[PDB]
Write a protein that binds this ligand. Structure first.
Ligand SMILES: CC(=O)N(Cc1ccc(-c2ccc(C(=O)O)o2)cc1)Cc1ccc(-c2cc(C(=O)O)nn2-c2ccc(Cl)c(Cl)c2)cc1
Length: 121
């Protein structure tokens, strides 16, 4: 029952209720660098809770080594221990991941879990 490994409903919680105390378990679907220029890279993540995906996650720069040393990569399952929500001038919310754990490596999971659908706002 693989979707049982993920915090189904956590993305709605974060976006609808603004719940910041949960420590949800999410799957990384994709990771991409953003254009930064003369400052450290920043990574944007498409994450799943098993029900929804959400594309507006960003990694705190302190966690960059996780991506660069390939421990945090597509398909891995993570627990988020600390995150902040920030809102852009245009109204979009960005979820900044400040502390997380990898609970299962990409290589140990191997696939996108379930069939999550994009969260709409
Ligand atoms: C002002 C603000 O709210 N920003 C977030 C933000 C807040 C806080 C910390 C923060 C706090 C602590 C730390 C840390 O420790 O690192 O970081 C980070 C980001 C700045 C910002 C915003 C947009 C981008 C960007 C660019 C590119 C690109 O090129 O393609 N795309 N985006 C982008 C566009 C839309 C979304 Cl929904 C997302 Cl997730 C990213 C980029 C930046």
């Amino acid at each position: 029952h693989m979707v049982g490994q993920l915090s189904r409903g956590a993305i709605a919680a974060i976006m609808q209720k603004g719940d910041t105390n949960i420590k949800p378990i999410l799957q990384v679907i994709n990771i991409r660098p953003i254009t930064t220029g003369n400052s450290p890279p920043r990574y944007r993540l498409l994450m799943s809770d098993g029900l929804n995906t959400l594309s507006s996650f960003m990694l705190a720069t302190q966690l960059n080594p996780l991506v660069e040393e390939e421990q945090l990569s597509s398909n891995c399952v993570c627990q988020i221990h600390r995150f902040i929500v920030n809102t852009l001038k245009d109204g979009r919310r960005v979820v900044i991941l400040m502390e997380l754990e990898v609970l299962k490596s990409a290589e140990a999971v191997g696939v996108k879990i379930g069939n999550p659908v994009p969260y709409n706002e």
